[PDB]
């Protein structure tokens, strides 16, 4: 998974 960024 990847980290949360808008």
């Amino acid at each position, epitope marked *: 998974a990847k*980290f949360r960024h808008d």
Partner: antibody
Amino acid sequence: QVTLKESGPGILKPSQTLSLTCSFSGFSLSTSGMGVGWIRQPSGKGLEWLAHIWWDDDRSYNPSLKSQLTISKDTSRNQVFLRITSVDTADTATYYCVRRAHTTVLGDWFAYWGQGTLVTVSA
Amino acid sequence: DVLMTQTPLSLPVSLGDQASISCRSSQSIVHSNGNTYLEWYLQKPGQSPKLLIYKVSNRFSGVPDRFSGSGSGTDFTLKISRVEAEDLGVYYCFQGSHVPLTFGAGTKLELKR
């Protein structure tokens, strides 16, 4: 002014549960886009990231430690908690509380760090 | 984990001298949204890490113009044009696009004599 203060037990025995508290101010975790998480650093060693919790209770964990880790929050009290079950001497480290947002305006980066809390795991 | 390899891990320098530190990642650190969350931190003894550079090349608050960052994909560099006394410490690169978030091992910027 933004502040972040970590608290923990100081010394703990192998196999028992570590409970860490971050108490912050100058921002709210109910602000959408906002998140708080944890990073540790063994004395004289590199930094290792642990977990992050978001305004909406989405989290990320370090997958190598996921069976041991539980992150939680109390937005009303300005607190975030980390639980590490059955610790061992390698879990000895300085534990930092850090703020990170997922929007540009709120600061998507590790700008604010607490002074860290030393936890020693020893029998 | 995305390995963050810094070169070198110990960098002696004279004051006034140029310095540069390489950071190469295991995979591309370009996020699904198209940005590259590569950051650089400086940590001094006793103190916690401080943000220097975000999104590859952008100076954070209080960071002098002698500091700069460059790179793309899997290959990054931090530069200091003239090293000063306050610059001495441990520099870490960091990726914040993939889980888990990973720092390199740290680079000691030290003095020459």
